[PDB]
Design a binder for these strands. Structure first.
Ligand SMILES: Nc1ncnc2c1ncn2[C@@H]1O[C@H](COP(=O)(O)OP(=O)(O)O)[C@@H](O)[C@H]1O
Ligand code: BEF
Ligand SMILES: [Mg+2]
Lengths: 73, 78, 93, 91, 641, 14
DNA sequence: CGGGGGACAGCGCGTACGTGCGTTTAAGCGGTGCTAGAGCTGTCTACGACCAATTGAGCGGCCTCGGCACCGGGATTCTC
DNA sequence: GAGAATCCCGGTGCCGAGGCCGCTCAATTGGTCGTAGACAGCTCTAGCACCGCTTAAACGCACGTACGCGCTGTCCCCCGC
């Protein structure tokens, strides 16, 4: 769903912050895509539950913050 | 060529698709910047530990197995 | 006959019996333990594979695929709640 | 290399021989098998240490599985383990 | 629906007053008419008129209001105008009729429409238009269409040959099928030797030198085998994109009566080609020969693989390097009675590539294997390479212009050793030294060779270098001339080549620039434009039509654009630039044969005069090592000859 | 043949 | 049990989000080409494990003293 | 403004904390033996960078409506005693 080239360029940027010189297996990039997609989708399902509890059709950033606090923190 | 991909690479249509997969009906235009931040944090959390795994192997290259170790424990807690 | 076939089991009792040492889990291991372990391993995989086979069969596919596994895993609440933190690569929602 | 795919194939043919399996699904099964194994073993070890025991036996695993496993799956699996070890020991 | 206007003629003034040469979504280019905003009213696609209104506004702004726009920029605007309008007029001329049908009109009458394709244009536009105009505008095209409808050169007219192969031997007569010129002994002997090889039954390689006639030779041979060997069943010619028009032009001059096609474009284009052009009564396929590019094979791999091909021909056949190439796979999923591989140099790099080629010709028939391989000197490998040489020699044709036609004047070739700038020295050191701060000042060390090589051609390939350079100049930013200086000073090669270019400018010499690096060819494009030079660029990004017409114009003798700038990977192959006397290379590749190909782009049957060739080599930097490895690769060529 | 002990909900996955 | 406040519903208005359309842009795929490090193998030396003896500290029990908590009274502070 | 609740101050009890002493076990010291790890070298492959080409996706703009927000009024419940 999410685009491997942008995604992996982001990944390498962040890695470059910690190490400053890396190599990556493409399988590692794939795994990071799968993980990030699954995590984000779960968080979306949560935040939607929040939005409907607040009787909105639109989700709001407040719903993201709340969901992340309650589940994640 | 002035823009930088790390933020931009994750972009309105893909976020929309993720939301639709997440069953969301409608979204505020503000949401995307929250999720990018959250994504960065999530990504930042995992990759740091993958780096340290790679350090303990003293290897330059990071494998999917290192990712699996970091993602295993971190994913279960989160 | 081999320990597995003696138990009727379809898993490498010798491997796991070795692995129980190789993983330091204990400096001693008792002969039934790897057998008992192998029995429950066979049972557990059979339950999931049966559901996944129905999933492939229902999708008119001979090939069991992550989608079919994921569909099975999430449909049983027990497996799903057992596996609630397992994530299936290329397993869609 | 040290992998169960042949045993997966055995039980696959034993449970749904009309179904093939993707190598991806097969690998997922291998990852699954390893995960459940290390889960039960790590628990039984720590239980044995708690019991001050240097040895792991059928009881430890029989207890650990009842701890890990959902209630139906537990007693079904427990019965399968006891049946299997009965056959093994009676042989 | 609305389609976007050819031309405009006489902001609210712009909207009310003016008139535009519309086109419509269902009507061919000749249905263009002058229309006005209120006359059309609201119609589907009016945003195109809005776009053209915006364009016309900015045209007015650039042509008339901006005081800076120089006279030569107005002349370039007039060129853009007249060149595009002439190309619209070419879209207003048919190129092909595909089929004919009579259809009922709303008046209850009926009319005979010809499915018409148009010049510079393809089967996305092509549509049924009443023959009443076709018959008067291009009766030649009507005649050719009536020929192409009826050639009986089609798959159903030929058998499964492989069971039998009659002999052939060399001949000394001009091919009678050919309208396009006059073969000499070498082209004819091409035809002859290919016919002999076919008559052994075999698949062959043509490697007489680059630009020496292969295209005309191969069309003459395919014509011979169609006529002589009744090879009426489809032939597939796979071609590098840029040369597909020239191959067409070859047919359109050398055997214009043949029923052959080029296969390209969007799925709609390719579908309409398949159904209308290929299929009769959907199957049997109307064409005798299909041109394709490599990727358009993959675009229809199994579909085209369903045809019983009688002949495969392959330009730049080193495009097939190894068995695992997706192209090599697809071409061996295809089945064919004959294969012919064309390249003015038969191997780029290594024995394994030639082994894969000969396996593609005759799989497993040649005992060429790593167990004897190219140790730089070895009696056993040198014996076996001469054994392979004599084994292959019946199956290769090779000559130089030195053999073929002493009339063709030779090439000067020279290396231009040049010093680093201070900027170059700094950055190169800052790659030899590992300075993450220097990277942070303008960011990866993960390929040091590439980083230092691209730096070594130009530090401006790091974007912060232009800022920090022009700011340490301080005046550099301030004016075009100060920018020009602050740029050109930054590499010694740039200074030298600027001197040489100024000399050629005084000479009136016509010159080709080549580089591996597209960003460098951009920096050089900007340098040329700020220097006020007239030139064209070519690289793999420009689509077919603009690149084609750019080549055509530059080959036109009146072309004031005296410089052509080219990529190697796209521009170095297949093309003839006979208007250019001189060639320069900023950087050799790992592979020498690519450089020989670039040279061939100048060096051709059509070259009027002795050519001159220069290589810009930085002093004491790795390219010397690259050059020595490329020379070793050339030693492999010298060993196989 | 590897029979399943649990009695569980029937599912359609199609 | 009584009183007050919050919750809920309905209505109006404006803005934001969604959809369509066209054009631009970068991804996706294939190929080019090379080098680095990945992994494997072999060898040698250091380090820990094991065993035995000796010594000192830690643990357990007891005693004494001080700190903390609770209770009562008065003054301060908030709330209606 | 007045009343109720909260805080501060002082005394006494009660126990726990802290210290001391003696004994036993663990820790330390020394020596022996072997194997695991470290080091070095070689070969293989996968990873990295860039170009060529197609096409689909993404972006930007305009148009429309629907949803969200705020306001108002009524009613019930829960809070407080
Ligand atoms: N038989 C011929 N007579 C005259 N000119 C020729 C002949 N063959 C080729 N040429 C010239 O060569 C040019 C084509 O180069 P070409 O040989 O087709 O490249 P290649 O064969 O290397 O692909 C044409 O412009 C044409 O003028
Ligand atoms: F293919 Be030729 F050398 F132009
Ligand atoms: Mg050619």
């Amino acid at each position: 769903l999410i685009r491997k080239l942008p995604f992996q360029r982001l990944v390498r940027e962040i890695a470059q912050d910690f190490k400053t010189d890396l190599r990556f297996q493409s399988s590692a990039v794939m795994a990071l895509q799968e993980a990030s997609e699954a995590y984000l989708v779960a968080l979306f399902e949560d935040t939607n539950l929040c939005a409907i509890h607040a009787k909105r059709v639109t989700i709001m950033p407040k719903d993201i913050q709340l969901a992340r606090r309650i589940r994640g923190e | 060529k002035v823009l930088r991909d790390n933020i931009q690479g994750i972009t309105k249509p893909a976020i929309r698709r993720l939301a639709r997969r997440g069953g969301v009906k409608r979204i505020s235009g503000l949401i995307y910047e929250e999720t990018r931040g959250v994504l960065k944090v999530f990504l930042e959390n995992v990759i740091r530990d993958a780096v340290t795994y790679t350090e303990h192997a003293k290897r330059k290259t990071v494998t999917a197995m290192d990712v699996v170790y970091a993602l295993k424990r971190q994913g279960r807690t989160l | 006959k081999t320990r597995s076939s003696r138990a009727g089991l379809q898993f490498p009792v010798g491997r796991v019996h070795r692995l129980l040492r190789k993983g330091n889990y204990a400096e001693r291991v008792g002969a039934g333990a790897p057998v008992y372990l192998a029995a429950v391993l066979e049972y557990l995989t059979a339950e999931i594979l049966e559901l996944a086979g129905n999933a492939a069969r229902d999708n008119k596919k001979t090939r069991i695929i992550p989608r079919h596994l994921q569909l099975a895993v999430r449909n049983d609440e027990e497996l799903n709640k057992l596996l609630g933190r397992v994530t299936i690569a290329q397993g869609g929602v | 290399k040290e992998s169960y795919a042949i045993y997966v194939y055995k039980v696959l043919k034993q449970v749904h021989p009309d179904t093939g399996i993707s190598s991806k699904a097969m690998s997922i099964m291998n990852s699954f098998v390893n995960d459940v194994f290390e889960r039960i073993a790590g628990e039984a070890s720590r239980l044995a240490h708690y019991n001050k025991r240097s040895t792991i036996t059928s009881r430890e695993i029989q207890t650990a599985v009842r701890l890990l496993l959902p209630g139906e799956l537990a007693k079904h699996a427990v019965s399968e383990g006891t049946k299997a070890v009965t056959k093994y020991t009676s042989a | 629906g609305i389609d976007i206007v050819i031309n405009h003629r006489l902001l609210n003034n712009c909207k009310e007053n003016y008139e535009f040469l519309i086109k419509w979504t269902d009507e061919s280019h000749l249905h263009n008419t002058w229309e006005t905003y209120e006359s059309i009213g609201q119609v589907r696609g009016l945003k195109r008129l809005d776009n053209y209104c915006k364009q016309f506004i900015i045209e007015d702004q650039q042509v008339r209001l901006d005081p800076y726009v120089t006279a030569e920029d107005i002349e370039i605007m007039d060129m853009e105008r007249e060149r595009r309008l002439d190309e619209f007029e070419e879209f207003h001329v048919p190129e092909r009729i595909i089929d004919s049908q009579r259809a009922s009109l709303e008046d209850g009458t009926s009319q005979l429409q010809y499915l018409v394709k148009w010049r510079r244009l393809n089967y996305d536009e092509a549509t049924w238009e009443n023959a009443t105009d076709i018959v008067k505008l291009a009766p030649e095209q009507v005649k050719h269409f009536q020929n192409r409808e009826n050639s009986k050169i089609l798959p159903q007219y030929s058998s499964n040959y492989t069971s039998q192969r009659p002999r052939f031997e060399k001949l000394s007569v001009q091919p009678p099928f050919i309208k396009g010129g006059e073969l000499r002994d070498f082209q004819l002997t091409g035809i002859n030797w290919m016919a002999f090889l076919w008559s052994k039954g075999d698949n062959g390689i043509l490697a007489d030198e680059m630009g020496l006639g292969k295209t005309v030779q191969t069309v003459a041979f395919i014509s011979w085998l169609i006529f002589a060997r009744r090879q009426n069943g489809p032939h597939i010619i796979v071609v590098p994109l840029s040369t597909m028009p020239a191959w067409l032009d070859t047919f359109e001059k050398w055997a214009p009566d043949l029923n052959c096609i080029c296969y390209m474009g969007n799925q709609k284009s390719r579908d309409t080609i398949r159904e209308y052009e290929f299929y009769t009564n959907p199957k049997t396929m109307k064409f005798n020969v299909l041109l394709t590019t490599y990727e358009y094979i993959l675009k229809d791999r199994a579909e085209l693989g369903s045809i019983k091909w009688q002949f495969m021909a392959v330009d730049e056949a080193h495009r097939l390097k190894n068995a695992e190439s997706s192209l090599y796979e697809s071409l061996n999923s295809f089945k064919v009675a004959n294969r012919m591989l064309i390249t003015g140099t038969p191997l780029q790099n290594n024995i394994k590539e030639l082994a894969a080629l000969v396996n593609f010709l005759m799989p497993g028939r040649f005992t060429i294997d790593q167990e004897i391989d190219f140790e730089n000197q070895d009696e056993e490998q040198e014996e076996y390479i001469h054994d392979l040489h004599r084994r292959i020699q019946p199956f290769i044709l090779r000559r130089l212009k030195k053999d073929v036609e002493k009339s063709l004047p030779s090439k000067t070739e020279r290396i231009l050793r040049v010093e680093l700038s201070d900027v170059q020295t700094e950055y190169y050191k800052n790659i030899l030294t590992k300075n993450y701060s220097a990277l942070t000042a303008g960011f990866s060390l993960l390929n040091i060779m590439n980083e230092l090589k691209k730096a070594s051609n130009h530090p401006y390939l790091f974007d912060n270098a232009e800022e920090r350079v022009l700011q340490k100049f301080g005046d550099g930013k301030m004016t075009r001339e100060n920018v020009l200086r602050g740029l050109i000073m930054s590499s010694g090669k740039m200074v030298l080549l600027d001197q040489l270019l100024t000399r050629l400018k005084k000479d009136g010499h016509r010159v080709l620039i080549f580089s591996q690096m597209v960003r460098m060819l951009d920096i050089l494009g900007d340098y040329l434009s700020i220097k006020g030079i007239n030139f064209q660029r070519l690289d793999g990004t420009v689509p077919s039509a603009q690149r084609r017409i750019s080549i055509d114009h530059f080959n036109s003798p009146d072309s004031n654009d005296f410089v052509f700038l080219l990529s190697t990977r796209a521009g170095g192959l297949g093309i003839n630039l006979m208007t250019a006397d001189t060639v320069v290379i900023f950087d050799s590749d790992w592979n020498p044969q690519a450089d020989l190909q670039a040279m061939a782009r100048a060096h051709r049957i059509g070259q009027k005069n002795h050519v001159m060739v220069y290589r810009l080599v930085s002093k004491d930097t790795v390219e010397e090592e690259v050059l020595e490895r490329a020379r070793k690769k050339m030693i492999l060529e010298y060993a196989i000859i | 043949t590897r029979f399943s002990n649990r009695q569980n909900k029937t599912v359609n996955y199609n």
